[PDB]
Design a protein around this ligand. Structure first.
Ligand SMILES: [Mg+2]
Ligand SMILES: [Mg+2]
Lengths: 346, 452
DNA sequence: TATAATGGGAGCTGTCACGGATGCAGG
DNA sequence: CCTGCATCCGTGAATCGAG
């Protein structure tokens, strides 16, 4: 029924870890990572490949997919060849396989346990352009990052180190996904810095600041022009479905004309121009008109040099330039007399 | 209609409220096997797929009534304030105190009146060593300083000149030492008084007995064997690498820690005992000890009679999941079933793909013959849908989308109005919602994440 | 990249009358 | 177990103007 409440129920099933339990899980994870390292030292295979194989057997056959980072394609055939290759190792060596498995299982249990933390953190970041659940899942990504980058030897409670990565993932998400026109994170930090600046000034001056006033309080490199440019960039688009009037019978996009598609006047004028130009090029010979049609690109749609037109007609390039001068000059005299193409000058 | 699921049921599966069973694989629940297309709760899924277990916290300071690996029935009392609510193997979690019984084999002497003592080639704990009508005074047969070593009951006297022991005497129960530690004794002065009957202590046992006759008394060179306990305190940041009743020699590690210091290292030969856990984990599982390299690994699912450890001399009795313990050196099989039960439109698409329309048409045609009104009505409706798909050539699994189409950009335009401002359709925000949640899912799958 | 932090938050309440599907007790 | 009635949810609710 309610996705948020349902996820909160799925979270309340997993109990919270005791200090001993939390240390134990983090211990098995870290030892598991070392086990994968050692198994890589022995087998002579990719640590990432080994990790994904161990991860596959732990999670089960319910999940089988290809991993981008890995070089080989990951399929049940491959993971069985490797698992059997791993279980072909002696007692003291095969031990590490059990350590890696136990580690991944502890990792699953650790991430599953601290999901309550993400919820109680992401609840504060609401209203910034991302939904509640979107924030939670992004904090879950950061939680995963925190688990894999955690070191239990420091005696720090996991919540302390997790919170940093969680906030980091959430903030990165809000910076990336919010704006319809995506803006780089550093530029967003700049714009938000401009927001806190303008708000500080408006709070002290009892009015909204000028471009120059903000330019001052921003420091060096900031003038009124650059401030105005930054604000122009931060402008978000507005919905075309924006209601016009107090009824629902009108929309905003209904009042916006199409500037791209040619009006019937445009297409008709273009056709009239092509016809009148052909009527003008027929006042010449077929040769001296062909020189121009090849020169300006009426035919084939390409403008040619004097060397190519001379390589076609069989005369010298100076003869071609001479013919094009005569043709253009004839068209000038034709224009001066007929007064037809003048209206197309636009 | 096609899958014969109500609006409530199809909702629960599609929006991940409950699972649905594709291939039960012999799984059963509460006495009845798992039927296909049966809806089971998340709790039903964890009890089936991953087996049932529960952890019970123990009150501060109190020890456990049961032992490690002890089979436990439902209602059985694990702790003075805790009662188990399920059947299964009990396990210790985090022992606060580790008691190590160090093995000690020494030789010690004793002099008693011949008429009083009972001649035996050896002596058991509690076994009477002598019966004395008149209280007898044990006398030091050497000069030196007294080192008094007291047990739970019974004592050891080590007389020594300089730093070298000159004599070692044993004092069984019923014998009160008349000297303190560090007292100087000459030859002849009484060390202890044995009043009435005297027996061997409960803890220490006499392995061998060598007797020698001298005058009206006898002297006994006894080869004794006993165990002295030593308690080790364990911190939350420390873990025990040694199982219950394991044998360790000098140098072996018992409890590891963050720093090399505070680490518990076995001083000598002795057995290890765990007490005062953080809690007790009761798991419905089968215990399989191994003395050799194990072939199966933790995380694997196994049917009864599968090759486990020691070249295949030990195998599984029940269906379940393998959890290899290297601490207790035992392969556990957590009682569970490898069952295929899913959620969402992936499960639905599967059920739609497996549907043979001709068969359902025939079944509903035979169903249309039934005298009841409602039977004929619902079967007609279902058959109408089946006939529709069959006549059209459409496949039911096309009602579920693997690839969601994208409307051309000009039909969902992003344009710059008169003032240079931008205006766009809501479909763009909708598609961005889709791509974001899709790409995040692909990343969460790639890196691997808990099923929650 | 490290004190520790671990289950959300605002609901919109003065339309109405239809078809059809769900579910209930009753013969 | 099968009919009948109560009840639930989803769907409609004039045209053109301007705004
Ligand atoms: Mg400035
Ligand atoms: Mg009605």
């Amino acid at each position: 029924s309610d996705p948020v409440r349902q996820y909160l129920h799925e979270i309340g099933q997993v109990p919270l870890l005791t200090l001993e339990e939390e240390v134990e899980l983090a211990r098995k994870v870290e030892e598991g990572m070392e086990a994968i390292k050692k198994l890589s030292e022995i087998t002579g295979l990719d640590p990432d490949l080994i990790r994904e194989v161990v991860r596959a057997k732990i999670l089960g056959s319910a999940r089988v997919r290809h991993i981008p980072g890995l070089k080989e394609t990951l399929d049940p055939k491959t993971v069985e060849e490797i698992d059997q290759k791993l279980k072909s190792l002696p007692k003291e060596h095969k031990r590490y396989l059990h350590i890696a498995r136990e580690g991944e299982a502890a990792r699953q249990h650790l991430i599953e346990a601290n999901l309550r933390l993400v919820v109680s953190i992401a609840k504060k970041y609401t209203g910034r352009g991302l939904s509640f659940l979107d924030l939670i899942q992004e904090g879950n990504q950061g939680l995963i990052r925190a688990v894999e980058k955690f070191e239990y030897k420091r005696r720090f409670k996991f919540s302390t180190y997790a919170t940093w990565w969680i906030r980091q993932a959430i903030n990165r998400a809000i910076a990336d996904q919010a704006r319809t026109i995506r803006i780089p994170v550093h530029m967003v930090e700049t714009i938000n810095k401009l927001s806190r600046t303008a708000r500080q000034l408006q709070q002290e001056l009892g009015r909204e600041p000028t471009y120059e006033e903000i330019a001052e309080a921003m420091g060096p490199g900031w003038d009124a022009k650059r401030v105005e440019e930054t604000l122009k960039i931060a402008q978000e688009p507005v919905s075309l479905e924006t209601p016009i009037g107090d009824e629902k019978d009108s929309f905003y996009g209904d009042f916006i004309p199409d500037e791209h598609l040619p009006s019937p006047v445009d297409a008709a004028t273009q056709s009239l121009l092509s016809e009148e130009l052909e009527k003008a090029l027929s006042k010449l010979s077929e040769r001296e008109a062909m020189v121009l049609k090849l020169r300006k690109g009426l035919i084939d749609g390409r403008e040619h040099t004097l060397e190519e037109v001379g390589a076609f007609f069989g005369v010298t390039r100076e003869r071609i330039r001479q013919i094009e001068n005569k043709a253009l000059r004839k068209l000038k005299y034709h224009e001066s007399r007929t007064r037809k193409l003048r209206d197309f000058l636009d | 209609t096609l899958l014969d699921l109500s609006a409530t049921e199809l909702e629960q599966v599609l929006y991940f409220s409950k699972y649905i069973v594709l291939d039960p694989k012999g799984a059963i629940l509460n006495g009845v096997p798992v039927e296909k297309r049966q809806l089971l709760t998340d709790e039903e899924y964890r009890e089936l797929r991953y087996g049932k277990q529960e952890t019970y916290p123990l009150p501060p300071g109190v020890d456990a009534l049961v032992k490690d690996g002890e089979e436990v029935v439902k209602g059985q009392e694990l702790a003075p304030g805790v009662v188990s609510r399920l059947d299964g193997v009990a396990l210790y979690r985090f022992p606060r105190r580790v008691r190590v019984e160090y093995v000690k084999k020494e030789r010690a002497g004793l002099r008693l009146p011949l008429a009083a003592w009972v001649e035996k080639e050896a002596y058991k704990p509690g076994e009477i060593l002598a019966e004395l009508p008149e209280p007898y005074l044990f006398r030091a047969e050497e000069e030196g300083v007294v080192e008094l070593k007291e047990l739970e009951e019974g004592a050891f006297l080590v007389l020594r000149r300089e730093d070298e022991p000159v004599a070692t005497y044993f004092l069984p129960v019923g014998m009160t030492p008349l000297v303190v530690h560090g007292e100087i004794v000459e030859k002849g002065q009484p060390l202890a008084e044995a009043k009435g009957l005297l027996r061997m202590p409960r803890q220490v046992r006499a392995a061998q007995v060598e007797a020698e006759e001298e005058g009206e008394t006898v002297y006994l060179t006894l080869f004794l064997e006993w165990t002295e306990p030593k308690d080790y305190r364990v911190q939350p940041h420390m873990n025990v690498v040694v199982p219950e009743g394991a044998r360790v020699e000098a140098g072996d590690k018992i409890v590891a820690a963050i720093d090399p210091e505070e680490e518990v290292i076995a001083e000598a030969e002795g057995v290890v005992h765990l007490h005062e856990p953080a809690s007790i984990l009761v798991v419905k599982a089968r215990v399989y000890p191994f003395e050799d390299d194990v072939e199966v690994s933790t995380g694997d699912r196994v049917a009864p009679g599968d090759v486990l450890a020691d070249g295949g001399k030990v195998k599984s009795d029940v269906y379940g999941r393998v959890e290899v313990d290297l601490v207790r050196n035992v392969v556990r099989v957590v009682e569970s079933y490898d069952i295929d039960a899913r959620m969402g439109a992936e499960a639905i698409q599967q059920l739609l793909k497996e549907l043979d329309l001709e068969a359902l048409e025939k079944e509903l045609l035979e169903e249309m013959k039934h005298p009841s009104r409602a039977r004929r009505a619902k079967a007609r409706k279902r058959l109408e849908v089946v006939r529709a798909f069959l006549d059209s050539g459409n496949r039911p699994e096309w009602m579920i989308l693997e690839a969601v189409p994208v409307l051309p950009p000009d039909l969902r335009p992003m344009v710059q109005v008169d003032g240079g401002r931008f205006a766009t359709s809501d479909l763009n925000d909708l598609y961005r919602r889709l791509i974001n949640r899709n790409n995040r899912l692909k990343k969460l799958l790639a890196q691997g994440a808990p099923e929650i």
